[PDB]
Design an enzyme around this catalytic site. Structure first.
Site, PDB file in Angstrom:
ATOM      1  N   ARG A 184       2.073  -2.249  -4.191  1.00  0.00           N
ATOM      2  CA  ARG A 184       2.051  -1.084  -3.341  1.00  0.00           C
ATOM      3  C   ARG A 184       2.919  -0.023  -4.017  1.00  0.00           C
ATOM      4  NH1 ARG A 184       5.572   0.357   1.768  1.00  0.00           N
ATOM      5  NH2 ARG A 184       4.611   2.395   2.213  1.00  0.00           N
ATOM      6  N   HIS A 193       4.815   9.189   0.505  1.00  0.00           N
ATOM      7  CA  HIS A 193       6.075   8.477   0.704  1.00  0.00           C
ATOM      8  C   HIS A 193       7.214   9.483   0.465  1.00  0.00           C
ATOM      9  CE1 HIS A 193       7.839   4.181   0.690  1.00  0.00           C
ATOM     10  NE2 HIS A 193       8.880   4.994   0.787  1.00  0.00           N
ATOM     11  N   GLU A 241       6.247   5.377   7.048  1.00  0.00           N
ATOM     12  CA  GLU A 241       7.307   5.582   8.042  1.00  0.00           C
ATOM     13  C   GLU A 241       7.391   7.021   8.568  1.00  0.00           C
ATOM     14  OE1 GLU A 241      10.768   4.130   5.884  1.00  0.00           O
ATOM     15  OE2 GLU A 241      10.261   2.021   6.212  1.00  0.00           O
ATOM     16  N   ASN A 244       6.750  -2.350   8.339  1.00  0.00           N
ATOM     17  CA  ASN A 244       7.933  -2.609   7.549  1.00  0.00           C
ATOM     18  C   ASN A 244       8.957  -3.198   8.476  1.00  0.00           C
ATOM     19  OD1 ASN A 244       6.585  -1.186   5.464  1.00  0.00           O
ATOM     20  ND2 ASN A 244       7.906   0.619   5.702  1.00  0.00           N
ATOM     21  N   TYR A 250      13.230  -4.799   8.489  1.00  0.00           N
ATOM     22  CA  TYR A 250      14.502  -5.108   7.788  1.00  0.00           C
ATOM     23  C   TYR A 250      15.552  -5.785   8.639  1.00  0.00           C
ATOM     24  CZ  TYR A 250      12.806  -2.383   3.885  1.00  0.00           C
ATOM     25  OH  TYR A 250      12.063  -1.914   2.846  1.00  0.00           O
ATOM     26  N   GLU A 286       6.611  -3.884   3.763  1.00  0.00           N
ATOM     27  CA  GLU A 286       7.979  -3.899   3.216  1.00  0.00           C
ATOM     28  C   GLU A 286       8.841  -4.882   3.970  1.00  0.00           C
ATOM     29  OE1 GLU A 286      10.112  -0.197   2.998  1.00  0.00           O
ATOM     30  OE2 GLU A 286       8.342   0.934   2.256  1.00  0.00           O
TER      31      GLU A 286
END
Ligand SMILES: OC[C@H]1ONC[C@@H](O)[C@@H]1O
Length: 443
Positions: free
Chosen positions: A74, A118, A163, A290, A292, A348
Site C-alpha cells: 500500500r 495521503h 484518515e 487503521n 493503533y 494500517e
C-alpha cells in the site's frame, strides 16, 4: 492460527513520509512542504525534504518487499507530482515515477494498493481554500480521473482518502497537521468536502476502471469508559461516532452524520449539507480500517467536546499510545455490525519503539513482534466470527517522517539509518516474513 486462502499480507507507506525530493522533476509544492518549512510546526525542524530518499531508492525498497515475500504494498501518490498546480497540467515525470513502481511490483507478483490522497495536497489548491472549498470535489475528481486513466490498467485496488478525520480535525481544528488551521467551522466543512470529493472519485472510477475495486481508509481508536456511569458510556459513544469510521460511514451507508456528531457539530456543518448526501452514498467496494491503540474516556463538563482522556498504566509505545490488542477485534466486529461492508482490510497496524541497532548489527524489536503478533491474533479471531477481513497491512515498511513528530518515531519493520540511508531489516520484519510465508501465526 491460519488465515483464509488468498489473504493479503501487506506493508504500507505514504509519499511524503518516505520519498524526499518533494520538488524534483517539476513537482508542485505540497501543504506538507510549506507546513514543515514553517518554524515551530514539526519536532526539531524536521521536513520531508530527504526522508527515506525513496524517490531514488524505490527499486531497493521494493526488492526488500519481494525478499520478505510480502504480497501487497500500500503506497500513496503525491498529487502535486502529478498535477503541480493541483488541476490542469499533468506532469509526465510524475506519472513515470509511479509507473516504474507499479510495473516493478507486478513483475515481482506484489499487489499494488494505491492511496490517492495521503495528506500532501498541492499548495496551489490550499491557496484556493483546500478542503475548505466545495470546489475541491471537482479538483479531486479530476486528479482521481488522471490516476485511473494512467494506472487503472494495472492497479485494481484503490483507496480515495487516508484518515479524513485526521485531515479535517488535526489539520483544520487542532492545527497540528498541515494546513495548520484552528477553526471548527472550517474543520467540519472539510469533513463534508472530503466526503463529497471521495464520492466524486468513486463515481468517476466506475466510468474509468470497469474491473477495479475502490474504498476508503479511516483511523480508529478503541474507546472504553472510565466507569459504569451512564455519562462515561455515552462519552464512549460520541468518541466512536466522531473519531472512528461512523463519521464517514454513516453518510456513505445511511445518508447522514451520526446522531452524537450532529448533537455536537450541526452548527459547524454547511447549512444545506443534506442536499449532498444522496451523492455521498456512492457505492464503495471495501472499508480500510487503521488501528493503533485504545483510550480510557470520561465525560468531562469542561472539555471542548465534553470528553477527556484518562491515563491508564498499560504498556505504551514510544508515541505514548496504550497497547490494547483487543481493540482491533472490537473495531472489526463493530464495523460489520453497524454497516456490514462487503470487504474489510486492516490498512494500517503497527507501533513505534525506540529501536537501536545492536553491536550484532541487528534490531531486536521483541516489543514490536509482541505488538504485531497480538493484533494479528485478534484479527484472526474476527475472521473466525465472520468479519470479511481480506487483508492486513503493517505500518510501515520503513522508518519514516512521522508528521509533526518528524523522524523521532520509528514505525518500520525495516530500520533506516538516515545518515547513510542504510536499510536494516528488523527482527519484526523477519518475523512478519515468516507469518506471510505461513499465512498466519505458529501459536
Ligand atoms: O501515526 C502512524 C500512521 O497513522 N496513519 C497515517 C500515517 O501517515 C501515520 O504515519
Amino acid at each position: 492460527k491460519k488465515f483464509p486462502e488468498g489473504f493479503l499480507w501487506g506493508v504500507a507507506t505514504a509519499s511524503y513520509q518516505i520519498e524526499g525530493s518533494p520538488l524534483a522533476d517539476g513537482a508542485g509544492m505540497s501543504i506538507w512542504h510549506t507546513f514543515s518549512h514553517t518554524p515551530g510546526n514539526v519536532k526539531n525542524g524536521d521536513t520531508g525534504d530527504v526522508a527515506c530518499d525513496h524517490y531514488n531508492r524505490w527499486k531497493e525498497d521494493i526488492e526488500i518487499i519481494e525478499k520478505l515475500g510480502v504480497k501487497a504494498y500500500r503506497f500513496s501518490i503525491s498529487w502535486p507530482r502529478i498535477l503541480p498546480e493541483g488541476t490542469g497540467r499533468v506532469n509526465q515525470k510524475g506519472l513515470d515515477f509511479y509507473n516504474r513502481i507499479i510495473d516493478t511490483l507486478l513483475e515481482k507478483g506484489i499487489t499494488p494498493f494505491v492511496t490517492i490522497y495521503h495528506w500532501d495536497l498541492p499548495f496551489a489548491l490550499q491557496l484556493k481554500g483546500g478542503w475548505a472549498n466545495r470546489e475541491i470535489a471537482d479538483w479531486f475528481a479530476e486528479y482521481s480521473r488522471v490516476l485511473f486513466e494512467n494506472f487503472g490498467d494495472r492497479v485494481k485496488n484503490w483507496i480515495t482518502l487516508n484518515e479524513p478525520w485526521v485531515v479535517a480535525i488535526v489539520g483544520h481544528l487542532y492545527g497540528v497537521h498541515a494546513p495548520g488551521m484552528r477553526d471548527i467551522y472550517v474543520a467540519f466543512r472539510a469533513v463534508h468536502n472530503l466526503l463529497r470529493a471521495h464520492a466524486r472519485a468513486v463515481k468517476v472510477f466506475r466510468e474509468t476502471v470497469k474491473d477495479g475495486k475502490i474504498g476508503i481508509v479511516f483511523n480508529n481508536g478503541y474507546f472504553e469508559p472510565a466507569s459504569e456511569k451512564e455519562e462515561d458510556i455515552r462519552a464512549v459513544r460520541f468518541m466512536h461516532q466522531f473519531n472512528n469510521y461512523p463519521l464517514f460511514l454513516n453518510p456513505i451507508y445511511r445518508g447522514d452524520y451520526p446522531e452524537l456528531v450532529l448533537e455536537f457539530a450541526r452548527e459547524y456543518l454547511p447549512e444545506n449539507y443534506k442536499d449532498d448526501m444522496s451523492e455521498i452514498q456512492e457505492k464503495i467496494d471495501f472499508v480500510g480500517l487503521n488501528y493503533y491503540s485504545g483510550h480510557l474516556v470520561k465525560f468531562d463538563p469542561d472539555a471542548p467536546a465534553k470528553v477527556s482522556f484518562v491515563e491508564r498504566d498499560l504498556p505504551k509505545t514510544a508515541m505514548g499510545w496504550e497497547i490494547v490488542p483487543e481493540g482491533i477485534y472490537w473495531i472489526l466486529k463493530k464495523v460489520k455490525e453497524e454497516y456490514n461492508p462487503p470487504e474489510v482490510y486492516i490498512t494500517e497496524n503497527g507501533a513505534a519503539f525506540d529501536d537501536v541497532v545492536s553491536e550484532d548489527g541487528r534490531v531486536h524489536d521483541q516489543n514490536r513482534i509482541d505488538y504485531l503478533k497480538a493484533h494479528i491474533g485478534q484479527a484472526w479471531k474476527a475472521i473466525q466470527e465472520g468479519v470479511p477481513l481480506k487483508g492486513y497491512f503493517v505500518w510501515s515498511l520503513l522508518d519514516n517522517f512521522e508528521w509533526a513528530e518528524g523522524y523521532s518515531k520509528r514505525f518500520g519493520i525495516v530500520y533506516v539509518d538516515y545518515s547513510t540511508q542504510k536499510r536494516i531489516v528488523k527482527d519484526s520484519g523477519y518475523w512478519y516474513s515468516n507469518v506471510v510465508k505461513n499465512n498466519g501465526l505458529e501459536d
